[PDB]
């Protein structure tokens, strides 16, 4: 079993790489913006499965639970990553190093502007709280593990919570400020979940009306709905 500090370091070593994607040469259309964003998502999904497998305890769960967790959390985990990438750039969504979208560029995709505004507002909350790197790592793991072998899972989630509490304690703030910071970080989990629910409705519709074709792993996740 790991100490809180060691668990955090394990999460740090597990971080997935930044997928590279570029703008098309021609101006964005509804179809081409949806193509660039789903292509990004599908590649990230491959690395996400590898990340989850490195979270201590995950591969000891039943293979059924592993499927269920990833199936439930994937959009949330993508959005959390995006928000972290975007945290020091107000008005912008840093999908990848060469795909940095200004808020208004979403005007070309029907319905996406609402979701961009949710992601941007939640990102601003994390900015105002001064979310720290180690806190981000614990929260992202908590998203996976709370998305819902059973004894193992509640234990795993508790270990990650203990790790977050440990990180907050290291900041040196008062006992009541520590409780307050824990509450404020965790209250943002429901905003991430809300944005995921809305993003999933949007993408499912776009797929359904054949605005954008999706393949392989992303296709398989969407067909589950």
């Amino acid at each position: 079993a790991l100490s809180p500090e060691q668990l955090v370091l394990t999460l740090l070593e597990a971080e997935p790489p930044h997928v590279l994607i570029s703008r098309p040469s021609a101006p964005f259309t509804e179809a081409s913006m949806m193509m660039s964003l789903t292509k990004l998502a599908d590649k990230e999904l491959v690395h996400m499965i590898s990340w989850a497998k490195k979270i201590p305890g995950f591969v000891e769960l039943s293979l059924f639970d592993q499927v269920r967790l990833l199936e439930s959390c994937w959009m949330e985990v993508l959005m959390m990553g995006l928000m972290w990438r975007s945290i020091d750039h107000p008005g912008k969504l840093i999908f990848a190093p060469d795909l940095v979208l200004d808020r208004d560029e979403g005007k070309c995709v029907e319905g996406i502007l609402e979701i961009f505004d949710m992601l941007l507002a939640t990102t601003s909350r994390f900015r105002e709280l001064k979310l720290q790197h180690k806190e981000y790592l614990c929260v992202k793991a908590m998203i996976l593990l709370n998305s819902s072998s059973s004894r193992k899972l509640a234990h795993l989630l508790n270990a990650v919570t203990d790790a977050l509490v440990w990180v907050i304690a290291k900041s040196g703030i008062s006992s009541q400020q520590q409780s307050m910071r824990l509450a404020n970080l965790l209250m943002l989990l429901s905003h991430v979940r809300h944005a995921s629910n809305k993003g999933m409705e949007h993408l499912l519709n776009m797929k359904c009306k054949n605005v954008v074709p999706v393949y392989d792993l992303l296709l398989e996740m969407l067909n589950a709905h």
Binding site: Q66, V67, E71
Partner: peptide
């Protein structure tokens, strides 16, 4: 209904 995800989960 998860051939790919299972394969990624099991691959090394």
């Amino acid at each position: 209904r998860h051939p790919l995800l299972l394969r990624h989960l099991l691959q090394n």
